[PDB]
Amino acid sequence: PTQKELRDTMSKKLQEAIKHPDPAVVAGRKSAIKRWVGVLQDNFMEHIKYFKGDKLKFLHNVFQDEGCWSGVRLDNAALGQRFTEEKIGGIDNPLRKYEMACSYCVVDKIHPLFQKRFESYRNKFPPGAFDGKTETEFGKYVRNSLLDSIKRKGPVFDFWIDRESGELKKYDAVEGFDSAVKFKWSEGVEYFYNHLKEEDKEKKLTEAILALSRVQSVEKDAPILDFCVNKIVDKDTLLQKLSQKDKGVYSLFAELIESCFFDTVHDLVQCWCYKEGDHSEKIFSQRDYELFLSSLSDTMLKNPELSVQARSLIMEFWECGSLYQYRKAAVNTSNYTVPTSGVFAELIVNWRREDIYKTDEEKEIEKKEILDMMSFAKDCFPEKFELFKKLIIRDLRLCGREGKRVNVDYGLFAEELFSELEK
Secondary structure, eight states, rough: OOHHHHHHHHHHHHGGGOOOOSHHHHHHHHHHHHHHHHHHSSHHHHTTTTHHHHHHHHHHHHHHHHEEETTTEEEEHHHHHHHHHEETEEEOOOOOOHHHHHHTOTTTHHHHHHHHHHHHHHHOOHHHSSSOOOOHHHHHHHHHHHHHHHHGGGGGGGGGOTTTTOOOOOOOHHHHHHHHHHTTTTHHHHHHHHHHHHHHHHHHHHHHHHHSTTOOOGGGGGHHHHHHHHOOOHHHHHHHHHSTTTTHHHHHHHHHHHOOOHHHHHHHHHHHSSSSOOOOOOOHHHHHHHHHHHHHHHHHOOOOOHHHHHHHHHHHHHHHHGHHHHHHHOOBBBBTTTTTHHHHHHHHHHHHHOOOOOOOHHHHHHHHHHHHHHHHHHHHOOOGHHHHHHHHHHHHHHOOOTOOOOOOTTHHHHHHHHHHHOO
């Protein structure tokens, strides 16, 4: 397989650890595991790629531990403790412990774990005195050589150890926070956030959100945006600042959706779009709206374990009263195209998906959602509905997407919905 397939395989394997009565909790924790492994790029995959047997079992047992979770998000303080232990439940820790202590800001263990790394690294040099240097000179030389080597894997692994003295470095909370944002180091952002003075927290969170909410955003930005948005106390002031930034609101929603932070997007739609001057003021554009829906339906197919939650957010955008104008324009056919043809096609693909068991009740809920959306398209533009139908069918036939069974005419499934609609 490709590296992407190996990451998806590793995520799916670690997701076997997740069991919980609440389906939203299961889905959210499974998405958290996928972000921890890495989706489009390696995150912790780099450390665990070749783990099998007891090495994988150690990770399984960590993610099975209810103490490692805060709702649907990983509890980094608890994870850091587990990932720096020598053994848990009779299984040796397979991870590079100094690197885990750095990443999770386990400040009581970074220095002693680095000393063990330093002592073994020193063992590749001759056992005597080296080049007549003093012990301090030689210790500074080996430590610098070791840290210069480790820093290739990321600035976090050369952040905590003083080059001159070898001691654990101390950071002011603002300096650490800014460095962690620069490093796209989500664990460090949270660690230093907890050390900011109360009067500084809102300003620093807002700075981070405005800096990262841009079309240049990448996957490692999303956990930082999610963390910062959920720590903001005054969401109305945040919107005022973000709406002054070019594509700021679009970029925030888009990055959160693509990384499956669905609960956060739900919360922001409620705060910013379902809130009750100009009653019809918009905070994102018609095209932004269509891109939210298309991103959600694409994420739904890529992550079927989240399909219920993705559909919920699609319907939140669809039925939001302040967005009714966008909803209508989203089903308007013009120049032989309709903005939501792919969304409808992907909802149909999801509805007909059979690789995971779903009850007849869940299938009927999915079907009714689709029929209700199609009925709206027909009611808005009855004279264009025949073209609308053709475009959905063509979109189903033109794309071979995830979750779509090969050599199956999905257009026939669309025709079944269309037929029920007329009668």
